[PDB]
Amino acid sequence: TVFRQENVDDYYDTGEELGSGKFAVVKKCREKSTGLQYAAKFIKKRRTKSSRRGVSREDIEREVSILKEIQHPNVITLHEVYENKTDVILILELVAGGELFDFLAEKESLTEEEATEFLKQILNGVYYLHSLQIAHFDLKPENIMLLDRNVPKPRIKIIDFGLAHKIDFGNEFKNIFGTPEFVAPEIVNYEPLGLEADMWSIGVITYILLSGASPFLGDTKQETLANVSAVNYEFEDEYFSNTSALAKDFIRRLLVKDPKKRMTIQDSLQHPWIKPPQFE
Numbered sequence: 001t002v003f004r005q006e007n008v009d010d011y012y013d014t015g016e017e018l019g020s021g022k023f024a025v026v027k028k029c030r031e032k033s034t035g036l037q038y039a040a041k042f043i044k045k046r047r048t049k050s051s052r053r054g055v056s057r058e059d060i061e062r063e064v065s066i067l068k069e070i071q072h073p074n075v076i077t078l079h080e081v082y083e084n085k086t087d088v089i090l091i092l093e094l095v096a097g098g099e100l101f102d103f104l105a106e107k108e109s110l111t112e113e114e115a116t117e118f119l120k121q122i123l124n125g126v127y128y129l130h131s132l133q134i135a136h137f138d139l140k141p142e143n144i145m146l147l148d149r150n151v152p153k154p155r156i157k158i159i160d161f162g163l164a165h166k167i168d169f170g171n172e173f174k175n176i177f178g179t180p181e182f183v184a185p186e187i188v189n190y191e192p193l194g195l196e197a198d199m200w201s202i203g204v205i206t207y208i209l210l211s212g213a214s215p216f217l218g219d220t221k222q223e224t225l226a227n228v229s230a231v232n233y234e235f236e237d238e239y240f241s242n243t244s245a246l247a248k249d250f251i252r253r254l255l256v257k258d259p260k261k262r263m264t265i266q267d268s269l270q271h272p273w274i275k276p277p278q279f280e
């Protein structure tokens with residue numbers, strides 16, 4: 001698919017850099033015709049087929065196609081897409097309250113209430129995506145952003161659809177590997193992947209929300225990956241002595257090696273606690 005080839009600067013004014021990735025730089029921007037603000041994600045294009053720099057057009061188109069499908073309070077939306085010789089520029093819904101990762105860096109540990117407040121929103125967003133057979137494949141606190149970080153119960157949106165795939169056969173068997181701390185054992189072992197990998201990542205996110213500690217993190221990437229494949233984690237009494245056993249049960253049912261035995265997004269919402277890149 002071809003995108004708009006007018007100069008983006010003719011229609012938007014850019015401001016503060018919001019962040020950057022392996023693939024993109026994201027800048028705050030304001031649309032001239034409406035005064036509304038967006039996050040413009042500039043993704044650097046591959047300059048030759050065999051190149052390793054930039055992102056392949058196939059990968060860019062996949063992120064755009066998925067984003068175009070989404071409309072839900074807990075996920076970002078796509079406003080417009082532009083392109084030029086060097087970049088594809090996605091005009092995304094702006095999430096102005098920063099990453100959950102930075103919010104956590106301030107607070108250390110949350111109460112079970114504060115953790116479940118975030119978690120319910122995360123689960124509602126993932127329920128939406130999984131209902132559409134979209135696996136995110138890179139869920140982590142850096143990919144959850146807050147609309148406003150200065151309210152007692154911040155509202156969130158899931159971002160970063162750079163590894164997201166449609167799972168039309170229940171599993172995909174391609175080159176997909178996210179952040180070692182958060183990937184499921186099937187990613188580590190290069191097995192067919194499905195929606196279940198996100199559910200694992202949610203277990204890791206929950207463990208971190210409650211304790212401020214990462215359950216599989218080793219001193220090198222290979223150690224983290226080996227810990228993940230072996231399901232080498234435990235609830236340290238120093239961090240979890242005052243956490244409810246029901247919270248631990250929720251985590252235990254997500255951090256399961258066999259994807260078929262892992263709780264699904266529907267199971268996670270009915271669970272009693274809730275129910276009301278890889279190389280060095």
Ligand SMILES: Nc1ncnc2c1ncn2[C@@H]1O[C@H](COP(=O)(O)OP(=O)(O)NP(=O)(O)O)[C@@H](O)[C@H]1O
Pocket residue numbers: 018019020021022023024025026039041076092093094095096099138142145159160161162
């Ligand atoms: N919609 C948004 N609103 C506000 N900030 C955002 C938004 N999207 C991305 N960012 C920031 O920009 C950073 C990079 O965006 P992201 O979509 O993660 O880029 P990427 O390079 O394609 N993937 P990765 O290497 O996994 O970060 C994020 O970690 C956020 O800090």
